[PDB]
Design an enzyme around this catalytic site. Structure first.
Site, PDB file in Angstrom:
ATOM      1  N   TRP A 139       0.535  -1.047  -0.027  1.00 53.19           N
ATOM      2  CA  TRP A 139       0.022  -0.046  -0.114  1.00 53.19           C
ATOM      3  C   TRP A 139       0.904   1.302   0.141  1.00 53.19           C
ATOM      4  O   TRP A 139       1.768   0.969   0.298  1.00 53.19           O
ATOM      5  CB  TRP A 139      -0.664   0.460   1.293  1.00 53.19           C
ATOM      6  CG  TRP A 139      -1.791   1.012   0.896  1.00 53.19           C
ATOM      7  CD1 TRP A 139      -2.326   1.864   0.674  1.00 53.19           C
ATOM      8  CD2 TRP A 139      -3.476   0.423   0.300  1.00 53.19           C
ATOM      9  NE1 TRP A 139      -3.844   2.641   0.858  1.00 53.19           N
ATOM     10  CE2 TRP A 139      -4.189   1.581   0.164  1.00 53.19           C
ATOM     11  CE3 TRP A 139      -3.656  -0.780  -0.155  1.00 53.19           C
ATOM     12  CZ2 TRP A 139      -5.589   1.232  -0.459  1.00 53.19           C
ATOM     13  CZ3 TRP A 139      -4.699  -1.142  -0.924  1.00 53.19           C
ATOM     14  CH2 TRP A 139      -6.279  -0.106  -0.785  1.00 53.19           C
ATOM     15  N   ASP A 207       0.587  11.238  -0.992  1.00 55.75           N
ATOM     16  CA  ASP A 207      -0.489  11.897  -0.732  1.00 55.75           C
ATOM     17  C   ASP A 207      -2.099  11.667  -0.897  1.00 55.75           C
ATOM     18  O   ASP A 207      -2.037   9.700  -0.276  1.00 55.75           O
ATOM     19  CB  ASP A 207      -1.229  12.935  -2.426  1.00 55.75           C
ATOM     20  CG  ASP A 207      -1.347  11.805  -3.367  1.00 55.75           C
ATOM     21  OD1 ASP A 207      -0.514  10.351  -3.427  1.00 55.75           O
ATOM     22  OD2 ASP A 207      -1.875  11.889  -4.522  1.00 55.75           O
ATOM     23  N   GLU A 210      -3.243   8.466  -2.708  1.00 54.47           N
ATOM     24  CA  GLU A 210      -2.607   6.951  -2.375  1.00 54.47           C
ATOM     25  C   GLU A 210      -0.902   6.460  -3.454  1.00 54.47           C
ATOM     26  O   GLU A 210      -0.923   5.491  -3.438  1.00 54.47           O
ATOM     27  CB  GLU A 210      -3.168   5.981  -2.078  1.00 54.47           C
ATOM     28  CG  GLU A 210      -4.399   6.465  -0.764  1.00 54.47           C
ATOM     29  CD  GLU A 210      -5.589   5.162  -0.260  1.00 54.47           C
ATOM     30  OE1 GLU A 210      -6.289   4.976  -0.814  1.00 54.47           O
ATOM     31  OE2 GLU A 210      -4.695   4.987   0.358  1.00 54.47           O
TER      32      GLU A 210
HETATM   33  C1  LIG Z   1      -8.161   2.692  -2.996  1.00 53.28           C
HETATM   34  C2  LIG Z   1      -7.408   3.104  -3.721  1.00 53.28           C
HETATM   35  O1  LIG Z   1      -6.516   2.500  -4.847  1.00 53.28           O
HETATM   36  C3  LIG Z   1      -5.408   2.845  -5.764  1.00 53.28           C
HETATM   37  O2  LIG Z   1      -4.330   2.156  -5.268  1.00 53.28           O
HETATM   38  C4  LIG Z   1      -4.284   1.377  -4.957  1.00 53.28           C
HETATM   39  C5  LIG Z   1      -3.792  -0.154  -5.086  1.00 53.28           C
HETATM   40  O3  LIG Z   1      -4.744  -1.020  -5.954  1.00 53.28           O
HETATM   41  C6  LIG Z   1      -2.741  -1.143  -4.754  1.00 53.28           C
HETATM   42  O4  LIG Z   1      -3.181  -2.698  -5.377  1.00 53.28           O
HETATM   43  C7  LIG Z   1      -2.370  -0.997  -3.660  1.00 53.28           C
HETATM   44  O5  LIG Z   1      -1.697  -0.624  -4.824  1.00 53.28           O
HETATM   45  C8  LIG Z   1       0.014  -1.184  -4.654  1.00 53.28           C
HETATM   46  C9  LIG Z   1       0.665  -2.633  -5.187  1.00 53.28           C
HETATM   47  O6  LIG Z   1      -0.087  -3.263  -5.352  1.00 53.28           O
HETATM   48  C10 LIG Z   1       2.231  -2.686  -5.761  1.00 53.28           C
HETATM   49  O7  LIG Z   1       2.134  -3.312  -7.310  1.00 53.28           O
HETATM   50  C11 LIG Z   1       2.743  -1.643  -5.696  1.00 53.28           C
HETATM   51  O8  LIG Z   1       3.729  -2.241  -5.152  1.00 53.28           O
HETATM   52  O9  LIG Z   1       2.369  -0.490  -4.055  1.00 53.28           O
HETATM   53  C12 LIG Z   1       1.511  -0.101  -4.405  1.00 53.28           C
HETATM   54  C13 LIG Z   1       1.208   0.849  -3.149  1.00 53.28           C
HETATM   55  O10 LIG Z   1       1.744   2.031  -4.016  1.00 53.28           O
HETATM   56  O11 LIG Z   1      -1.636   0.495  -3.614  1.00 53.28           O
HETATM   57  C14 LIG Z   1      -2.783   1.523  -3.974  1.00 53.28           C
HETATM   58  C15 LIG Z   1      -2.913   2.791  -2.491  1.00 53.28           C
HETATM   59  O12 LIG Z   1      -1.365   3.290  -2.047  1.00 53.28           O
HETATM   60  C16 LIG Z   1      -5.174   4.015  -6.883  1.00 53.28           C
HETATM   61  O13 LIG Z   1      -4.343   4.000  -7.277  1.00 53.28           O
HETATM   62  C17 LIG Z   1      -6.133   4.927  -5.495  1.00 53.28           C
HETATM   63  O14 LIG Z   1      -5.889   6.539  -5.970  1.00 53.28           O
HETATM   64  C18 LIG Z   1      -6.675   4.537  -4.635  1.00 53.28           C
HETATM   65  N1  LIG Z   1      -7.832   5.743  -3.188  1.00 53.28           N
HETATM   66  C19 LIG Z   1      -9.039   5.845  -2.891  1.00 53.28           C
HETATM   67  C20 LIG Z   1     -10.059   5.487  -2.248  1.00 53.28           C
HETATM   68  C21 LIG Z   1      -9.822   5.863  -0.990  1.00 53.28           C
HETATM   69  C22 LIG Z   1     -11.268   5.047  -0.158  1.00 53.28           C
HETATM   70  O15 LIG Z   1     -12.099   6.045  -0.545  1.00 53.28           O
HETATM   71  C23 LIG Z   1      -9.561   7.229  -0.478  1.00 53.28           C
HETATM   72  O16 LIG Z   1      -8.874   7.781   0.790  1.00 53.28           O
HETATM   73  C24 LIG Z   1      -8.425   7.826  -1.226  1.00 53.28           C
HETATM   74  O17 LIG Z   1      -8.262   9.169  -1.493  1.00 53.28           O
HETATM   75  C25 LIG Z   1      -8.882   6.776  -3.221  1.00 53.28           C
HETATM   76  O18 LIG Z   1      -8.206   7.936  -3.834  1.00 53.28           O
END
Ligand SMILES: C[C@H]1O[C@H](O[C@H]2[C@H](O)[C@@H](O)[C@@H](O[C@H]3[C@H](O)[C@@H](O)[C@H](O)O[C@@H]3CO)O[C@@H]2CO)[C@H](O)[C@@H](O)[C@@H]1N[C@H]1C=C(CO)[C@@H](O)[C@H](O)[C@H]1O
Ligand SMILES: C[C@H]1O[C@H](O[C@H]2[C@H](O)[C@@H](O)[C@@H](O[C@H]3[C@H](O)[C@@H](O)[C@H](O)O[C@@H]3CO)O[C@@H]2CO)[C@H](O)[C@@H](O)[C@@H]1N[C@H]1C=C(CO)[C@@H](O)[C@H](O)[C@H]1O
Ligand code: NA
Ligand code: NA
Length: 492
Positions: A139, A207, A210
């Protein structure tokens, strides 16, 4: 899929009738917001009380988790409702369950760290499982906005308890509960979040969306707010040196936000660059709806907050305008909109709500976009303050709000136009601001689900809802837009 979701469907949405729509959604969106908050007296009476799910969607996408950010923003809406109701016990119990669950989450070790790390490093963790356990998957962690928004929400509850309920908490005879007094809430829940912000504001995290690491305007802004707002709380509990620490740290963050260290105020392009390191990397040019969402969250309409970067800030307002212009060209769904339109997160966005391809407009960004002009008008009218329009923002006003040459024919020869409260020119601009705000709520009406629930996104081509279902933050953003619209229109 979203198996626990229960529709209200107490009216047929009429997409030709904005006034009626907004009357009904004032109640329907509150129903959907409260449905995603676990409390014994609510629909979500089978969850751990105080748990806020971001959405009932458990697949495509799976948003059935509690994010510190969404939960706090959700409770800012609950608090606005509580305040409007002169302190409703049902809502107050929900807030206290959230405070208690926040206590427990703070003390839960997770991949970001633990409570006993330096300045409670673990509080940076973006989300937890609904059962309270740590989320151990990959994450974008940490996210340093969460502790700030939570500190602010819980501080505001304490102010409300003192101002509206004679200093009385409502759950202190319950067994589950990790506080016996307002001082316990301050010392054991608010203060640790504030210590986290003091300790980590100038460190690297992700940010609010995320996705990227480095400097973020929204994060720094919500941090500055939490620190500033807690000064008087600290003083109230005879925590005077810490109060002055909060004040100095808030001042330091204000200077950071406004100057070349933060890099947010960009005078080449005359707007806020939301993520200045990405401008450096040449991956994003800095337009982001977080730029105006933050100011809206940190200047709640009851407060007359003096914290920096309200919606009247010329750089914030130009980011808003330029994102609107971008999104009106980028999304085919906006092709027939003459005024406001469906707004997304940032022009470079590829998140489609359940994977990557092209980004979409978001219901929450669109609802916040209505609030910007509502608040410009409200702030001016409510305080009898002048409306000052900087030259940076002349194009925005001339395109959407007023022919500035009718206010002052020589406006192009001045650095600004100042419109005096009570003048016909002032009433024209205030009224036109509200009409413009309304156009964004009409975009929501055009595309909301028949059941009155709001997803995270709406498709950039068709406008059909997509992504997480009945997103709590979507419901809250719409609720706050309606509250603001009603408040400004009620002014004589
Ligand atoms: C919910 C969220 O989803 C998207 O970002 C996620 C991924 O879906 C998720 O797989 C995980 O990503 C990692 C990945 O699996 C891995 O290969 C790699 O090593 O690193 C990643 C982590 O850096 O993590 C992210 C989130 O960090 C989108 O890109 C996001 O924008 C998204 N956020 C949404 C959801 C919510 C909940 O309502 C809000 O809080 C938020 O503001 C929003 O933008
Ligand atoms: C009643 C219905 O209305 C809303 O749907 C909209 C769109 O949001 C909107 O963009 C516009 O769609 C056009 C679109 O711009 C374009 O792709 C294409 O050229 O054609 C469309 C115009 O014919 O028009 C409609 C209104 O007709 C909502 O977005 C909907 O949720 C909503 N209900 C639909 C959807 C569902 C399930 O998703 C059904 O349950 C239901 O029977 C149906 O009415
Ligand atoms: Na207790
Ligand atoms: Na202000």
């Amino acid at each position: 899929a979203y198996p626990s979701f229960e529709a209200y469907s107490n009216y047929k949405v009429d997409r030709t009738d904005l006034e009626t729509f907004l009357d009904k959604q004032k109640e329907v969106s509150l129903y959907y917001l409260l449905q995603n908050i676990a409390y014994p007296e609510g629909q979500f009476n089978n969850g751990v009380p105080g748990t806020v799910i971001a959405s009932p969607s458990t697949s495509n996408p799976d948003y059935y988790y509690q994010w510190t950010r969404d939960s706090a923003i959700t409770f800012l809406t609950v608090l606005s409702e509580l305040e409007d109701n002169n302190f409703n016990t049902t809502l107050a119990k929900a807030v206290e369950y959230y405070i208690n669950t926040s206590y427990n989450l703070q003390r839960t070790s997770n991949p970001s760290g633990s409570f006993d790390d330096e300045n409670h490093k673990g509080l940076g963790e973006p989300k937890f499982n609904t059962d309270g356990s740590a989320y151990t998957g990959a994450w974008g962690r940490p996210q340093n906005d969460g502790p700030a928004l939570r500190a602010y929400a819980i501080s505001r509850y304490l102010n409300d308890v003192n101002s509206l309920n004679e200093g009385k908490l409502v759950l202190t005879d319950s067994g589950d509960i990790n506080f016996s007094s307002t001082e316990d809430i301050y010392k054991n829940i608010i203060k640790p979040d504030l210590e986290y912000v003091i300790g980590y504001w100038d460190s690297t995290g992700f940010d609010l969306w995320e996705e990227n690491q480095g400097r973020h305007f929204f994060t720094s802004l919500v941090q500055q707010k939490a620190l500033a707002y807690a000064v008087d709380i600290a003083k109230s509990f005879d925590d005077g040196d810490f109060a002055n620490t909060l004040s100095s740290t808030a001042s330091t963050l204000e200077s950071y936000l406004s100057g070349s260290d933060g890099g947010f105020v960009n005078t080449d392009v005359n707007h806020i660059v939301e993520n200045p390191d990405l401008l450096q990397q040449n991956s994003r040019q800095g337009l982001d709806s977080a730029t105006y969402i933050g100011p809206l969250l940190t200047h709640d309409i009851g407060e007359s907050s003096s914290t920096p970067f309200d919606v009247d800030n010329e750089y914030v307002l130009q980011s808003y305008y330029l994102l609107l212009e971008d999104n009106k060209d980028r999304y085919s769904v906006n092709s027939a909109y003459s005024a406001g339109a469906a707004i997304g997160r940032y022009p470079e966005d590829v998140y489609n709500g359940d994977g990557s391809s092209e980004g979409n407009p978001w219901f929450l960004a669109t609802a916040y976009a209505a609030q910007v002009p509502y608040k410009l008008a409200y702030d001016a009218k409510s305080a009898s303050n002048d409306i000052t329009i900087n030259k940076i923002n002349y194009d925005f006003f001339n395109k959407y709000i007023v022919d500035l040459s009718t206010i002052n024919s020589a406006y192009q020869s001045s650095d600004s136009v100042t419109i005096k409260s009570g003048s016909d020119e002032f009433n024209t601009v205030a009224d036109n601001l509200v009409t413009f705000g309304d156009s964004f709520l009409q975009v929501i009406l055009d595309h909301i689900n028949d059941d009155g629930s709001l997803n995270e996104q709406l498709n950039r081509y068709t406008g059909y809802s997509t992504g997480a279902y009945s997103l709590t933050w979507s419901s809250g953003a719409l609720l706050e837009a309606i509250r603001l619209r009603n408040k400004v229109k009620a002014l004589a």
